[PDB]
From a paper:
FMDV is the causative agent of foot-and-mouth disease, a highly infectious disease of cloven-hooved animals. The crystal structures of 3D alone and in complex, e.g., with RNA and the primer peptide 3B (also known as VPg) have shed light on the mechanism of RNA polymerization. In summary, we have identified novel cis and trans functions of the FMDV 3D RNA-dependent RNA polymerase that are essential for viral RNA replication.
From this we concluded that disruption of residues G216 and C217 was responsible for the replication-defective phenotype in the dsRNA exit site. The X-ray structure of the 3D-GC216/7AA polymerase, in complex with the RNA template/primer 5′-GCAUGGGCCC, was solved at 2.8-Å resolution. The main differences lie in the template entry channel, in particular in the M16-R17 segment, located distal from the mutated region.
Author numbering: 1 to 476
Amino acid sequence: GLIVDTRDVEERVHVMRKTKLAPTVAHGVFNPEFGPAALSNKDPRLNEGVVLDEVIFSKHKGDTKMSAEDKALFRRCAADYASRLHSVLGTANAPLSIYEAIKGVDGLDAMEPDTAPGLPWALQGKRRGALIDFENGTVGPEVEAALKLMEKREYKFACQTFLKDEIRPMEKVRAGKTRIVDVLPVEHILYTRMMIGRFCAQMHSNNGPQIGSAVAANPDVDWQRFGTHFAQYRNVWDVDYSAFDANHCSDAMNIMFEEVFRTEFGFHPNAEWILKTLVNTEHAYENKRITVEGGMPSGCSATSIINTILNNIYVLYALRRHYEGVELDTYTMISYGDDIVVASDYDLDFEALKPHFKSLGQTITPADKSDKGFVLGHSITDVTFLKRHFHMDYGTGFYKPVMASKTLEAILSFARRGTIQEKLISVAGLAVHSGPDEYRRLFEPFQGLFEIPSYRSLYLRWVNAVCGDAAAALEH
RNA sequence: AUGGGCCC
RNA sequence: GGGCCC
Ligand SMILES: [Mg+2]
């Protein structure tokens, strides 16, 4: 988006500047060029002459403004994709009762009780359980007024900025581009789920190529489904965006809300309204207070679904701007926020589509950086989705999600205080698809110290998950 | 460190 | 309550 006023207020918000990630026994062996993100502005590992506040907000390179013809095309693409969307899901997108938004429904999980509450609650020294009691599922006095203050449409707020204590490649760590988190107020998350929660739950359960969404998908079972679909098309593309969320232009966000969440399809009038509050946000970061126009806050309700919807609309908009006679039938795709896979039997020139994406403020790039161009003839066994490759299991011929060994080495090389044993359990379910030799090698530093599940136990569990008949048939 | 997922 | 993905 576009930063419009950086302000210095007397009050200051504290930011976590101490990594909980510590090296493990595996770090000494694997020597990964990965490390914890720089949280302090006086971090020794930073390259000299790098201010952390400067690098963080560098993702806002302006807010692209569209012409009326570009907006009328985007409005048609939003209306066409919304027609397909609400035709698969149905139009049962009525509001949600107050405690349905808290305890969830079929497809939508419950809210997290012990996560940061946002502003202005955090500035009092307040946990989230004080405002909303989650055991019963009711709100307290502060949220009482805000809920109906949102109904009045008077509700103003601000996003609390947070540093993401995660593992990053050492080039990004020394460059100081630590990723941030825009924490919205808890009452805003509650009210958003009331307006569009039933829509989100219906998307979760209906994920797949038909709606172009992979949100709420389980790669262990869903990759035989996705893999066989994209293996049916001549050309496959692995497109990468740069700052996909920050570069959503105001016009594209506003037009998408006006077309997807219409009261025609069953939503409440405030569904369009509450989503439009995300366009022009105020952000608090210690002394600073930053007003921004455009971009999506990375930390709000339905932020993955909104990004997934925009991603689907961007492809339809770009193709129609360059070619003639293009519909949703022309191509197939599936996305999970910025991550996207596209395919078509037509010979689509994606190099030619780069400027048409640039009119939306987005910059597309081939994930396979070699040659530095979108070539044709790639298959599903070339591309990556959700940090996993589509490889066919040699034993049962099913597609399985395989992660690169150096990605698993980075994951295994760091861990928080005493969370190692169950992290080894969780990661082993990911490492099983790298094969028996690679699985034993990834956990060799740990054996004799921790419990390591057998490759046999995890492979059998996966066979039953992808298809319980596959386990039974192998028995007869 | 958030929103939402998926596994335990 | 922990891990992983976006
Ligand atoms: Mg990608």
